Every structure is written in structure tokens, then in C-alpha cells.
Design a protein around this ligand. Structure first.
Ligand SMILES: [Zn+2]
Ligand SMILES: [Zn+2]
Ligand SMILES: [Zn+2]
Lengths: 161, 267
């Protein structure tokens, strides 16, 4: 994982076998992508099929333009849920990134909290509370003068999708 | 009279603002009544009644740190008037402009008024200390004045003027200033005990609590505090307040959020 440039480093959990949930979440997304590619490939063959049956294989199913329509109708429907889930998360992420950049432009880099400038239990409870407070603020646009709390390294499964 | 009361001294202050700065609350009252009469006498002019009145009370271009309603609240006594030379746990400041370097110090009120405009910093030594300012300097917080007049003047200002809406020189709305004051006094005053050096053994001030209770009854004060950090109620200081010089895309993002750090810190 090659490391991000300074205009985006603030948005990464970084330093400026056991099981894990994220392993399994990621590998299922990896596996999902394969099937989507294969479906696309088969849809890719349809125009040439009246040649790529008989010139290639002893026997195969006859099919027609009307059937291609209905297949395509069916395929689109089955993707809508995952599409909505992808889109909504991506928009939310891009918004948080662009806002953090605009604030980095308008703010003062002399301040120790500027994105370009920047204990156990209590620091951890600090991290968690900063996160919960940033979450509650963000819902109503009550977040005008501090960086949104975010990490992108969890989002590997939306990257695959 | 209008000219004499709108004329500014060598520090920018009208006679009214001077009466407040000097704790001459009955004189401030006398002038403030008179200033209302004067503004109400010149209603025949092409100016609005208010412009004249604001000119005499708190003139345009006044540094916010000198706005009278704020100054009246800052006018408390030095802790030494009630602690004497006893050591109590309180906040303390060094003042380098005055040679009050890190072994020495003054209490919060001296730092706010006796050392206004100096290099002063919040000190890191133990809080169990009295305040050296009455001994090392010409300390202006030793005199209480007339308490009943101080309170009467506050009531009048709150109904006479829109000054409640201004933030101070650190972006603190007046209410956020008062409530921090009460919270601080609550700890300091619980250490008080009944019994060439200045008059000690006085009773501690309850003005901040009385002032907080009265201000909280004013709709304008309350609305002005709760709407703080809205796009209309633009915080002048430390708060992304200059934006027009950035390219338009970053403005359309950065206008959309709104602030609550101070409203949350108050609540
Ligand atoms: Zn003092
Ligand atoms: Zn003093
Ligand atoms: Zn000083």
C-alpha cells in the first residue's frame, strides 16, 4: 500500500495469524468481483453468438434479441442494491475529502491542528469520543471548523466493488 | 454637550466610557441618562436617533475589547481584597512587559485589566498563591466602587444598547464569558474564610452570578448566543472568517457547514 500525499494523509490511520473481520469482508468482495466480470464477459459475447456458437462448439442453446433484452433487464435489477450501497458511501467519502482540502487551503498552517501540520485507555477513549462527536456533528452540517474524523483503510471492500 | 460627550481622549474613550473604566458608576449613569436626552433632543436632524446615541456611548471603530457592556463585567476586584496575603488555589499569570517574570505573578482580574494589552501568559507554577500586582505596580482592581450602582448601570445598558450581540477580542460572546466566570469563582470563593499593605478582609464579589442570572433573562442575549456560529452570526476570530480570496469551488463547499464549538462549550 504505497503511502498517500500530504493533502490526503490526514484522512488515513497512519503514524504522522490472528483472525480479523476485515480479512473476510475483503476476500468476499474480491470473490464477488470475479462473478461480475464473468457476467459482463458473457454479455459481451451476445452480438457475435450466431458465429461464436457454430464455429467453436458442437452444441449450444439457441437465443434471440428478445431474450437478450430480458436477460439485460434481469441483470440490472440484481445489481441495484449493491450499486446504491457503493454510490452512497463513495459520495459521502468524496465530500469529506474535498471539504478537508478546502479547509486546508483557508486555514493557518501555523496552527498545530492544521491537516498539514499534524495514555492508552484515555487516548483510546479520546479517539472514540472524537469519532462519535464527529459523527453526530456531521449529520446536520454542524461541522464547520475541524477536520472530519475518517480512515479509508477500512473501505477496501467498497474499492473492490 | 453632544460634542464634549462624543469627543475621544488619548485612549479613544468618550467621557461615558471613562466613567465606566474608572468605576464612577453614578457618573456613568448621570452621563448615560443625559446622552439619551441629547440623542432624543436632536431627532430633528437627518441622522437616526441611534447613530448619535451609539456615537456617545460606544463609537464606531471602537476596539471590541473596550465596548462598555463588556468593560462593566470585567470590573471585578483583585482576589487580594478578600484573600489578603493567604495562599489559595487560583489561576495565575506572568506579565513580561512589566518584569513580572515567572517567579512572580498576578491573578486573572489584574491580568485582564491592570495588565490589559501587555505580554501576559497563563503561568505553570502551583496555583496556591496570592497576587503581587498591588505591591509591584499601580493596581487598578483594588477598588470595589458602589456595588448597587454597578448593577443598576448593567440593567440600563442591557436595555439601552445592542452591545450584548458583540463578541469580545477572543470571539467569546458575553454569555460564554459570564458562565466561565461563575464556574471559576465557584471554586475560588469556596476557599474564603471569615477573620503599607492594601485593605484586605473584604467579602468576595457575587456580581458575575447576578449578572449571569439577569442576562439570561434577555431574549436578545439568549438568541444571540444560541445562533452564534451560524452564517449570519459570523464569528470574527479564529473561525474561517476570511474566504473571498479562495477559488469559487472551495467556497461552495466551505460555506455549507456551520459552527457549534462555542455553543457546545457553553452548554
Ligand atoms: Zn490581583
Ligand atoms: Zn492588579
Ligand atoms: Zn503588565
Amino acid at each position: 500500500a504505497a503511502q498517500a500525499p500530504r493533502s490526503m494523509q490526514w484522512a488515513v490511520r497512519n503514524t504522522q495469524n490472528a483472525s480479523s473481520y476485515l480479512t473476510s469482508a475483503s476476500s468476499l468482495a474480491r470473490a464477488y468481483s470475479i462473478v461480475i466480470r464473468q457476467i459482463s464477459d458473457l454479455m459481451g459475447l451476445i452480438p457475435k453468438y450466431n458465429h461464436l456458437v457454430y464455429s467453436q462448439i458442437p452444441a449450444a442453446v439457441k437465443l434471440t434479441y428478445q431474450d437478450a433484452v430480458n436477460l439485460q433487464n434481469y441483470v440490472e435489477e440484481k445489481l441495484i442494491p449493491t450499486w446504491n450501497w457503493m454510490v452512497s458511501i463513495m459520495d459521502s467519502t468524496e465530500a469529506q475529502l474535498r471539504y478537508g482540502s478546502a479547509l486546508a487551503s483557508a486555514g493557518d498552517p501555523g496552527h498545530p491542528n492544521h491537516p498539514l501540520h499534524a495514555q492508552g485507555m484515555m487516548s483510546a477513549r479520546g479517539d472514540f469520543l472524537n469519532y462519535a462527536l464527529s459523527l453526530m456533528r456531521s449529520h446536520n452540517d454542524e461541522h464547520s471548523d475541524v477536520l472530519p474524523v475518517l480512515d479509508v483503510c477500512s473501505l477496501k471492500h467498497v474499492a473492490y466493488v | 454637550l453632544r460634542e464634549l460627550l462624543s469627543a475621544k481622549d488619548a485612549r479613544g474613550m468618550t467621557p461615558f466610557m471613562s466613567a465606566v473604566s474608572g468605576r464612577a458608576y453614578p457618573a456613568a449613569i448621570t452621563i448615560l441618562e443625559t446622552a439619551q436626552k441629547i440623542a432624543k433632543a436632536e431627532i430633528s436632524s437627518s441622522e437616526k436617533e441611534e447613530d448619535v446615541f451609539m456615537g456617545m456611548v460606544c463609537p464606531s471603530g471602537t476596539n471590541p475589547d473596550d465596548s462598555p457592556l463588556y468593560v462593566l463585567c470585567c470590573n471585578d476586584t483583585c482576589s487580594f481584597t478578600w484573600t489578603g496575603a493567604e495562599h489559595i488555589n487560583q489561576d495565575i499569570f506572568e506579565c513580561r512587559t512589566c518584569g513580572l517574570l515567572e517567579s512572580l505573578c498576578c491573578c486573572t482580574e489584574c491580568a485582564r485589566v491592570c495588565h490589559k494589552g501587555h505580554d501576559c501568559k497563563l503561568k505553570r507554577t502551583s496555583p496556591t498563591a496570592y497576587c503581587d500586582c498591588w505591591e509591584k505596580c499601580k493596581c487598578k482592581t483594588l477598588i470595589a466602587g458602589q456595588k448597587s450602582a454597578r448593577l443598576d448601570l448593567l440593567y440600563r445598558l442591557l436595555t439601552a444598547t445592542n452591545l450584548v450581540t458583540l463578541p469580545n477580542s477572543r470571539g467569546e460572546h458575553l454569555l460564554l464569558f459570564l458562565v466561565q466566570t461563575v464556574a471559576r469563582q465557584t471554586v475560588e470563593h469556596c476557599q474564603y474564610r471569615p477573620p503599607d499593605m492594601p485593605d484586605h478582609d473584604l467579602e468576595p464579589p457575587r456580581f458575575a452570578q447576578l449578572a449571569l442570572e439577569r442576562v439570561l433573562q434577555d431574549w436578545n442575549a439568549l438568541k444571540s448566543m444560541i445562533m452564534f456560529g451560524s452564517q449570519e452570526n459570523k464569528d470574527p476570530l479564529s473561525a474561517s472568517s476570511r474566504i473571498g480570496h479562495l477559488l469559487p469551488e472551495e467556497q461552495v463547499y466551505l460555506n455549507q457547514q456551520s459552527g457549534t464549538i462555542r455553543l457546545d462549550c457553553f452548554t
